[PDB]
Amino acid sequence: GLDKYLPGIEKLRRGDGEVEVKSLAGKLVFFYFSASWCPPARGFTPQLIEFYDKFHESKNFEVVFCTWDEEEDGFAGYFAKMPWLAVPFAQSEAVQKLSKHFNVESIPTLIGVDADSGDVVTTRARATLVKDPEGEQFPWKDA
């Protein structure tokens, strides 16, 4: 499923180490497009962290940070303040291509895909999450 979006990426960053992309089997995966330089992400990111902490286990999802930072130091510092996963900075080309694939034109943006099938579940989670902190309508399926 995820090979479509992350072709040939076997590992993702978690904290100061890595996990295998295989560990996402059966999960909903949210690609979180953001950057340290993005003003509206400052207010949004803590709301996503609260939702993640409450529900990532019980609602069976993961978040993968897809950076629009162009400096490694900016990327690393920003990711260090997140509890979830990241596409490694070295694989930024994959992130740019993914941004194009989903027509991400502004950040922050949050897109949820099913890991096993690769199917798109929601493209609007950055907008819907802030209005549904208890996830009563999760995963905010697209029509």
Explain briefly what this protein structure is.
The chain is an alpha/beta fold and 143 residues long. It has a single domain, classed as Glutaredoxin (3-Layer(aba) Sandwich). It contains four helices and seven strands, in the order βββαβαβαββα.
- The side-by-side strand order for the widest beta sheet comes to 2-1-5-4-3-6-7
Number of domains: 1
Beta-strand fraction estimate: 15-25%
The CATH class assignment is Alpha Beta
Which structural class do the helices and strands define?
Answer: alpha/beta
Write the element-wise H/E pattern from the N-terminal end onward: EEEHEHEHEEH
PDB class: electron transport
Keywords: tryparedoxin-I, synchrotron radiation, anomalous dispersion, oxidative stress, oxidoreductase
Assembly: monomeric
Entry title: Mutant tryparedoxin-I Cys43Ala
Q: Which properties best describe this structure?
A:
synchrotron radiation, Glutaredoxin, crithidia fasciculata, 7-stranded mixed β-sheet, globular, disulfide bonds tryparedoxin, tryparedoxin-I, electron transport, alpha/beta, 143 residues
Explain the overall architecture.
By secondary structure, the protein is of the alpha/beta class. It has one domain (1-143): Glutaredoxin, CATH 3.40.30. 28% of the residues lie in helices and 23% in strands. The chain has 4 helices and 7 strands. The chain has helices spanning 39-55, 72-79, 92-101, 125-129, and strands spanning 11-14, 17-20, 28-34, 61-67, 85-86, 109-114, 120-122. A 7-stranded mixed sheet has the order 2-1-5-4-3-6-7. Strand 6 and strand 7 (120-122) form a beta hairpin. It is globular and about 35 Å long. The PDB classes it as electron transport. The entry lists the keywords synchrotron radiation, thioredoxin, anomalous dispersion, oxidoreductase.
